[PDB]
Amino acid sequence: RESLVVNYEDLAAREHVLAYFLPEAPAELLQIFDEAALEVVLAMYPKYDRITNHIHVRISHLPLVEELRSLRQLHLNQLIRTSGVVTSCTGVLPQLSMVKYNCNKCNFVLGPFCQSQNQEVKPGSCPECQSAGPFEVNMEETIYQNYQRIRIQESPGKVAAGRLPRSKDAILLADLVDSCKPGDEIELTGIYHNNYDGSLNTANGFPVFATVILANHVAKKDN
DNA sequence: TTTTTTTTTTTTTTTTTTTTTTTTTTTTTTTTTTTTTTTTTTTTTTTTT
Ligand SMILES: [Zn+2]
């Protein structure tokens, strides 16, 4: 299952310093948690390392829940809990995860590069023939991960008298995909994320930033 | 006219500079085209007393 759900209540109990740090810097703290859990699991099941070589630490019951309309730039790069209704949901897409390239000048397979969520990986030279020239994804030696983009609006009951429901895009990755269906009311925990390529720099108008939530944890509220 | 020292002076290169020649080289935007909606202007089947 490659997914380890850690409650926040008991993490704030046992180790409150981490629980203070985690909302402020969730990317790094979550990377640390993932690697620590991975090696704990390898200690417990040494054979298990052939399976997925990565443990996803999900975090539950994060105390303070901000609703979709109250999200601000104060919340940028922070772990938030919202709640809403899934309105749209792409199919599971295959996203480059550890991507190998072909130098199509000498056919050398450029070594595995980690694909981050906020920047297109582009190699420099190839290490053999030193061509800056064109590369192509080697799709046989690349590994991918499941990617899904959902849209979540505010619950219509939770919307005030004269006001429209606001919606956000969230990104489900690799173990979270297909956990939501349109019309589901979910509790979404994730990083309120700004900095990938969403900035209206293209003279279309104001220099505003589009925002997404890197989902960390999805709780479906139903039977 | 036999012996003998300066003299080049042609041949090896080497330096060595100055000049001309050689070698190298994808990415990123934009745009047309196609296929869609969508409000509006008709126009073609519906029925009555
Ligand atoms: Zn090459």
From Swiss-Prot:
A zinc finger (C4-type) spans 103-129. Phosphorylation by the CDC7-DBF4 complex during G1/S phase is required for the initiation of DNA replication. It is found in: Nucleus; Chromosome. The modification Phosphoserine is found at residue 155. Signal peptide: none annotated. Early fractionation of eukaryotic MCM proteins yielded a variety of dimeric, trimeric and tetrameric complexes with unclear biological significance. Specifically a MCM467 subcomplex is shown to have in vitro helicase activity which is inhibited by the MCM2 subunit. The MCM2-7 hexamer is the proposed physiological active complex. It is linked to Deafness, autosomal dominant, 70: A form of non-syndromic sensorineural hearing loss. Sensorineural deafness results from damage to the neural receptors of the inner ear, the nerve pathways to the brain, or the area of the brain that receives sound information. DFNA70 is characterized by slowly progressive, postlingual hearing impairment. Acts as a component of the MCM2-7 complex (MCM complex) which is the replicative helicase essential for 'once per cell cycle' DNA replication initiation and elongation in eukaryotic cells. Core component of CDC45-MCM-GINS (CMG) helicase, the molecular machine that unwinds template DNA during replication, and around which the replisome is built. Component of the MCM2-7 complex. The complex forms a toroidal hexameric ring with the proposed subunit order MCM2-MCM6-MCM4-MCM7-MCM3-MCM5. Component of the CMG helicase complex, a hexameric ring of related MCM2-7 subunits stabilized by CDC45 and the tetrameric GINS complex. Interacts with DBF4. Interacts with KAT7. May interact with MCM10. Component of the replisome complex composed of at least DONSON, MCM2, MCM7, PCNA and TICRR. Forms a co-chaperone complex with DNAJC9 and histone H3.3-H4 heterodimers. Belongs to the MCM family. This is DNA replication licensing factor MCM2. The chain holds residues 227 to 449 of 904 of the full protein.
